[PDB]
Amino acid sequence: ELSFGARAELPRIHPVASKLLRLMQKKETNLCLSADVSLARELLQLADALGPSICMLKTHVDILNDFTLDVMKELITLAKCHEFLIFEDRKFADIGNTVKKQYEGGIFKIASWADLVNAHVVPGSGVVKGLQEVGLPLHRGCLLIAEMSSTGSLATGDYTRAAVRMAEEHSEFVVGFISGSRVSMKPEFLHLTPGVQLEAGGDNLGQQYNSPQEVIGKRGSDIIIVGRGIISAADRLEAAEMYRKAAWEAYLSRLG
Amino acid sequence: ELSFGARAELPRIHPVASKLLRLMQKKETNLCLSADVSLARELLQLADALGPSICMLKTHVDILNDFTLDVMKELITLAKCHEFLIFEDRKFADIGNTVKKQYEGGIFKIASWADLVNAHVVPGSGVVKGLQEVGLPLHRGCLLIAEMSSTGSLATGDYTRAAVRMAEEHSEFVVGFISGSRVSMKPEFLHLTPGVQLEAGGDNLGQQYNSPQEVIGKRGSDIIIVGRGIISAADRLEAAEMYRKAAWEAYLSRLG
Ligand SMILES: O=C(O)c1cc(=O)[nH]c(=O)n1[C@@H]1O[C@H](COP(=O)(O)O)[C@@H](O)[C@H]1O
Numbered sequence: 001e002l003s004f005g006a007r008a009e010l011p012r013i014h015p016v017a018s019k020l021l022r023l024m025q026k027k028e029t030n031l032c033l034s035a036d037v038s039l040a041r042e043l044l045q046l047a048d049a050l051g052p053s054i055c056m057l058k059t060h061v062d063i064l065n066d067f068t069l070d071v072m073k074e075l076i077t078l079a080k081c082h083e084f085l086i087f088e089d090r091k092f093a094d095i096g097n098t099v100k101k102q103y104e105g106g107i108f109k110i111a112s113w114a115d116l117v118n119a120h121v122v123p124g125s126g127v128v129k130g131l132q133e134v135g136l137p138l139h140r141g142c143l144l145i146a147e148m149s150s151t152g153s154l155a156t157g158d159y160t161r162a163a164v165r166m167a168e169e170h171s172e173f174v175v176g177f178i179s180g181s182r183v184s185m186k187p188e189f190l191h192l193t194p195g196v197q198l199e200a201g202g203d204n205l206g207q208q209y210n211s212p213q214e215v216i217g218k219r220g221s222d223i224i225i226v227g228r229g230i231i232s233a234a235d236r237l238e239a240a241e242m243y244r245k246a247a248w249e250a251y252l253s254r255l256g
Numbered sequence: 257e258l259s260f261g262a263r264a265e266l267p268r269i270h271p272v273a274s275k276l277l278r279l280m281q282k283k284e285t286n287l288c289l290s291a292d293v294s295l296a297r298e299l300l301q302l303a304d305a306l307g308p309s310i311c312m313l314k315t316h317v318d319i320l321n322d323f324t325l326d327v328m329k330e331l332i333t334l335a336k337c338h339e340f341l342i343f344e345d346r347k348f349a350d351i352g353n354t355v356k357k358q359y360e361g362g363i364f365k366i367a368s369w370a371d372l373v374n375a376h377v378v379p380g381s382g383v384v385k386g387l388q389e390v391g392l393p394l395h396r397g398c399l400l401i402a403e404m405s406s407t408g409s410l411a412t413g414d415y416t417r418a419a420v421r422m423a424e425e426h427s428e429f430v431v432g433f434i435s436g437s438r439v440s441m442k443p444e445f446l447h448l449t450p451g452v453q454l455e456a457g458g459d460n461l462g463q464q465y466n467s468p469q470e471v472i473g474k475r476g477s478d479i480i481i482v483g484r485g486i487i488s489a490a491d492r493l494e495a496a497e498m499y500r501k502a503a504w505e506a507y508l509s510r511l512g
């Protein structure tokens with residue numbers, strides 16, 4: 001098993017994955033903050049304070065009450081300053097012709113500011129083809145959703161195998177997965193795992209939590225995605241540091 | 257098999273489905289226009305001219321370059337005037353906690369103007385639970401995506417059966433399906449079928465077309481969803497009338 005720094009140099013590595021892996025090793029962080037807030041001011045204050053602790057900031061631009069492209073300009077300034085990627089968790093899931101417009105256009109112009117986006121594989125490979133016609137020219141990457149954290153997820157068995165095949169057949173654009181575990185044996189592919197908290201539990205709407213030690217150490221994922229475990233805490237900086245240290249040590253102990 | 261007018265009166269019918277079925281029978285239309293345009297002026301001119309020909313106008317609010325909630329105010333005026341429902345084709349596909357915010361909030365406030373939305377079933381029933389916590393109080397309905405029109409779709413076999421079970425267990429909110437065919441034997445549930453053109457063919461990004469006669473007449477669906485077959489035509493009104501007459505006659509001939 002290679003370090004994040006060595007994976008950043010693999011011959012078939014995508015440039016976005018390389019940039020991410022380099023800054024993960026430099027900063028000793030494999031934490032993605034899920035910045036699940038409705039105010040631009042809160043998003044930017046979290047990005048600035050937690051920037052040093054995270055490899056990535058995951059957005060849901062469509063829950064932000066005061067979205068403007070200028071808010072995203074301020075977020076890019078912080079991402080450059082503190083060295084993290086921006087991941088818009090849009091979960092594209094339409095025919096190729098539709099997702100290309102949803103990615104490039106409308107009010108959000110997601111491709112203009114998002115290093116990474118993600119897509120469901122259920123529509124077939126046209127979803128990836130459509131996205132890549134916008135994303136490849138704009139030097140972007142995509143994650144495919146191979147497994148989900150929620151109760152009753154149908155992303156199991158043959159579905160997960162289809163996501164892995166799709167990623168591997170579109171390696172020019174697809175840089176990894178949303179998954180609960182290592183699903184690809186190819187080290188050029190990132191595994192990002194949501195549904196993470198230090199304590200056992202869930203929410204009232206089908207979310208299920210596992211610990212950083214379980215998902216990084218035992219299940220072999222690369223990055224933890226954490227929302228409420230940080231966002232709902234009083235001291236979001238110390239919460240981020242707890243999750244960072246947990247995920248980083250789990251990674252180190254798997255390397256040996 | 258019951259007429260649309262008789263289905264509108266079924267004991268377990270959802271109010272949104274009843275309203276739709278009534279206006280389908282009154283207007284002799286089972287055509288949903290996919291208004292896949294980037295300009296508000298074009299969306300509103302299409303809604304006004306084609307309103308009399310359609311039972312429903314399907315939007316992708318996130319490809320509209322000049323979206324404002326006022327554009328949607330003007331669309332609701334036309335929907336009321338010409339008697340059609342508004343369907344936002346958002347394809348919600350996240351955990352329940354996330355989709356409730358995506359449905360109610362952000363810039364789009366989808367639940368404030370959309371009669372219908374749709375959701376993927378891949379995350380499990382939490383996607384429906386989350387949406388219904390916003391949609392039930394706002395007297396809205398939801399369609400579950402049981403089958404898709406695109407090449408390589410994984411929405412087949414056990415997946416489609418899971419979508420039907422989910423719909424039937426959430427009939428307070430779920431009014432039907434996006435599907436290629438009749439998937440539910442319960443007549444209270446609408447079947448809406450995209451991937452429709454009069455001529456054989458496809459697009460370059462995995463879309464596959466079937467005719468109105470095939471999907472309404474042979475496959476037993478209720479409503480055709482048509483985008484480019486109308487939108488790319490020179491005379492979009494005459495194109496809409498051709499699709500309306502095709503879908504309506506296919507429906508009548510299945511009734512006998
Ligand atoms: O793509 C995602 O990040 C995602 C996939 C998934 O399987 N589960 C999942 O929880 N998510 C997202 O990750 C975040 C989890 O947030 P918390 O449950 O608050 O930690 C939310 O923003 C979800 O939308």
Ligand SMILES: O=C(O)c1cc(=O)[nH]c(=O)n1[C@@H]1O[C@H](COP(=O)(O)O)[C@@H](O)[C@H]1O
Nearest residue numbers: 094095098290404405434450451482483484
């Ligand atoms: O939910 C949808 O309407 C949808 C589902 C599906 O399986 N296939 C599909 O084509 N669609 C949508 O229906 C429309 C089809 O447009 P045309 O191919 O131009 O007729 C697009 O807006 C798609 O996003």
